[PDB]
A paper describes a structure:
The phage nuclear shell is composed primarily of one protein, termed chimallin (ChmA) or phage nuclear enclosure (PhuN), which forms a single-layer-thick flexible lattice that separates the phage genome from the bacterial cytoplasm. Pores in the ChmA lattice are less than ~2 nm in width, large enough to pass metabolites but too small for passage of most proteins or messenger RNAs (mRNAs). We found that one of these proteins (gp2) associated directly with self-assembled ChmA in vitro, suggesting that it is an integral phage nuclear shell protein and prompting us to name it ChmB. We identified a key protein, ChmB, at the center of this network that is likely to have multiple roles both as a pore for macromolecular translocation through the nuclear shell and for capsid docking and genomic DNA packaging.
To determine the structural basis for ChmB interactions with other proteins, we recombinantly purified the protein from several jumbo phages and determined a 2.6 Å resolution crystal structure of ChmB from the related phage PA1C (gp2; 38% identical to ΦPA3 gp2). Overall, the ChmB dimer adopts a distinctive U shape with dimensions of ~5 × 8 nm. NTS-mediated interactions define ChmA homotetramers that measure ~11.5 × 11.5 nm, whereas CTS-mediated interactions mediate interactions between neighboring tetramers. The distinctive U shape and overall dimensions of the ChmB dimer, at ~5 × 8 nm, suggest a model in which multiple ChmB dimers could line a hole created by the removal of four or more neighboring ChmA protomers from the lattice (two possibilities shown in Fig. 5b). Combined with our data showing that gp2 interacts directly with self-assembled ChmA, these data suggest that gp2 is an integral component of the phage nuclear shell that is directly involved in the docking and filling of capsids through an interaction with the portal. Based on these data, we propose that ChmB mediates capsid docking and genome packaging at the nuclear shell through a direct interaction with the portal protein. We next aligned ChmB homologs from jumbo phages that infect Pseudomonas species and identified two highly conserved surface residues: Q53 and A159 (ΦPA3 gp2 numbering). We generated point mutations of these residues (Q53A and A159D, respectively) designed to alter the ChmB surface and potentially disrupt specific protein–protein interactions.
Author numbering:
A (entry chain B): 1 to 24, 34 to 121, 136 to 192
B (entry chain A): 1 to 24, 34 to 120, 137 to 192
The structure:
């Protein structure tokens, strides 16, 4: 019986003490998180995954273009409907406002010439949401890859089919 | 200017408070976890992902066949080397022993025939859960044997049958 030890013993020991604490037989699938203030927030495994995946950028939703990301995240049914009527976003601005946790999603729809303009004040645009949207901007082109994990910064992302830019305030 | 509110406000609130605590600008990428007794364990994002994904079954290493899973997990170089010599595992047993945190990975290699046996130590509840996901991913019939820990069983595998024998 060739005795073989696990390579990451110490790292494994941490997992054991945690997993052993989740036993109640089954695993609770829910981990408590302690913040700076000292408050425990009970989050399910799926929520912890989502929080980490968004901050790291591995979340599948962060591959979406910034506009499509906002549309999927804020349930912008009106902009889906105009897409089904032959309209496409020809230009859009995302104004991120850290104070107030808002995001102004404004732009111009065109048939391609009929043109409709839109404007949405996306509330609750927290730090997490600011990080996520920076991942969408960075995944559009390698030119914007440096703008990744940017939060608590007021900026406007201007997009056209010919140029994309981030202007700071 | 139409005002659109986020659907999951409260779920987001929890994230925000937590995310505020990781700010040092950049994020700490490390979360502090509290267990039942009241002990805090500060684990990195990568570790927490690995722990959660292992318990849920989403980890990529759990798709591997159970023997190839063990080989990769414990760095069983000897079984790779004999593989390079035209030998293949014709039969293998995995005896899970919860008391003592061991897994006996025994079996037979054939091209002459060399049999093998490994005592995989530190086979904890997390690893017992992982192995149950590999057994379940082998066939749909064995899917019920998922998330099994603290149970003494032997997994017998042949090319023509697979079985879980409980003790």
């Amino acid at each position: 019986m060739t005795a073989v030890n696990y390579p990451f013993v110490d790292t494994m020991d941490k997992f054991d003490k945690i997993t052993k604490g989740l036993i109640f037989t089954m695993i609770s699938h829910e981990l408590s998180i302690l913040d700076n203030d000292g408050v425990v927030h009970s989050l399910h495994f799926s929520q912890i995954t989502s929080l980490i995946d968004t901050i790291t950028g591995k979340h599948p939703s962060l591959e979406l273009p910034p506009q499509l990301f906002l549309i999927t995240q804020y349930l912008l049914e009106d902009l889906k409907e105009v897409g089904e009527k032959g309209f496409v976003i020809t230009e859009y601005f995302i104004d991120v406002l850290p104070t107030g946790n808002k995001a102004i999603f404004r732009g111009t729809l065109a048939h391609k010439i009929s043109k409709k303009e839109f404007e949405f004040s996306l509330n609750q645009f927290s730090i997490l949401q600011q990080i996520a949207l920076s991942h969408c901007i960075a995944n559009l082109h390698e030119e914007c890859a440096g703008f990744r994990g940017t939060f608590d910064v007021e900026y406007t992302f201007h997009w056209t089919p010919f140029a994309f830019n981030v202007k700071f305030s």
